[PDB]
Ligand SMILES: Nc1nc2c(c(=O)[nH]1)N=C(COP(=O)(O)OP(=O)(O)OP(=O)(O)OP(=O)(O)OC[C@H]1O[C@@H](n3cnc4c(N)ncnc43)[C@H](O)[C@@H]1O)CN2
Ligand SMILES: [Cl-]
């Protein structure tokens with residue numbers, strides 16, 4: 001199943017954190033990377049007193065189940081010193097977020113898919129669109145349309 005993963009980092013040299021993530025991800029069992037988007041520098045979504053983010057999107061083919069994929073990505077995060085912080089949107093070495101999991105819709109204790117609020121987030125939407133311009137969400141909403149009917153800010157490349 002094609003799992004679209006969003007990679008983010010704005011601490012401990014984002015480019016290295018991201019390359020690391022990309023190596024571990026393909027190292028995931030029964031999985032391989034179809035595609036990776038470009039590397040983008042994006043402004044913090046919340047508080048501004050932190051560095052810009054490196055953001056990317058990956059198409060990972062995987063035979064793992066959704067929450068099984070989460071155990072794996074979360075290991076990698078932990079491996080990259082990502083810290084559980086109280087308040088959201090503060091900075092962090094690594095984020096591996098499952099944006100979409102095939103065409104599925106998951107609303108479990110641990111997993112919400114498609115990722116909460118991702119339809120309002122250019123740092124998630126632009127890389128994704130780069131690698132799947134033809135993508136349609138489970139509710140039928142088309143990605144190219146979503147990106148067309150609001151002038152979401154253009155991404156600068158990292
Ligand atoms: N430019 C830019 N600005 C950003 C960026 C970014 O990439 N780029 N990212 C964030 C944080 O993203 P965001 O998740 O909304 O906020 P967080 O601080 O991460 O807070 P959080 O997501 O509520 O906490 P978390 O540690 O990410 O995650 C807490 C729990 O959510 C659960 N979880 C539920 N659904 C998912 C999913 N689809 N993918 C991954 N994890 C998912 C898992 O069971 C997980 O243990 C803020 N600003
Ligand atoms: Cl949807």
Ligand SMILES: [Mg+2]
Nearest residue numbers: 088095096097
């Ligand atoms: Mg998060």
